[PDB]
Design a protein around this ligand. Structure first.
Ligand code: BOG
Ligand code: SO3
Ligand code: CA
Length: 207
């Protein structure tokens, strides 16, 4: 099976886009070919769970890319050896850590280095980060940086592709919960529509 790790923070852990992506995989005829991997397996009870849903993920509410890069990622990828890694991180670096864009892209680099050390053929999706309701400018600065980072980092052996979940790709405030940070059902549909097709293409590419 193709092993996929859905790495992230609360936007991965406590949201419902992962079931939608699994549905897409199912619809593509790939549910028997795909194993979602990771240390966590919680899903909120208000999400519409497809039957057969693979609940494993590597989402952690409140965790920062800074910390994950330095303390956790090597363990997680060493334990699971994913073929594909999809992530959105950085929201807590800003809102909790008060870190800048240079910090966050640096932490990206350290995470990707660890993913590749575990698997030099890993295929990676980096998500441009959803906006906060208040259009946090350091989040946008990370988003403006992601394409250059990808250009610097992507290789034929280990491609890095972008799932653009940003303001600029259509993420509206109407897609946020009342806390101004997490996607509501509309934002989950949007997220799943950006990630799911890139993830399906990568799955198909895995040898
Ligand atoms: C720094 C932000 C860290 C994560 C805060 C997560 C807040 C999640 O909030 C929770 O969402 C649930 C639905 O998903 C609701 O059922 C709960 O009542 C609510 O507390
Ligand atoms: O969860 S509903 O507000 O889009
Ligand atoms: Ca699994």
């Amino acid at each position: 099976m193709v092993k996929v790790m859905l790495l992230g923070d609360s936007i991965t852990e406590i949201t419902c886009w992962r079931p939608l992506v699994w549905e897409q995989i199912t619809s593509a005829g790939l549910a028997g070919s795909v194993d979602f991997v990771g240390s966590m397996n919680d899903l909120q009870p208000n999400c519409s769970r497809p039957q057969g849903f693979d609940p494993d993920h590597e989402g952690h509410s409140g965790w920062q890319a800074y910390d994950i890069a330095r303390n956790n990622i090597a363990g997680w990828v060493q334990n699971t050896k994913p073929d594909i890694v999809q992530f959105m991180l950085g929201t807590n670096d800003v809102n909790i850590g008060h870190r800048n864009a240079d910090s966050i892209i640096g932490s990206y680099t350290i995470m990707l280095n660890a993913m590749r050390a575990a698997n030099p053929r890993v295929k990676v999706i980096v998500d441009k980060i959803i906006p906060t309701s208040w259009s946090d400018a350091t989040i946008e600065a990370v988003n403006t940086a992601i394409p250059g980072w990808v250009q610097q980092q992507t290789t034929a052996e280990s491609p890095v592709v972008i799932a653009d979940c940003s303001r600029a790709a259509g993420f509206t405030n109407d897609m946020l919960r009342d806390d101004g940070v997490h996607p509501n059902s509309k934002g989950d549909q949007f997220i799943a529509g950006q990630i799911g097709p890139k993830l399906i293409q990568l799955i198909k590419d895995v040898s």
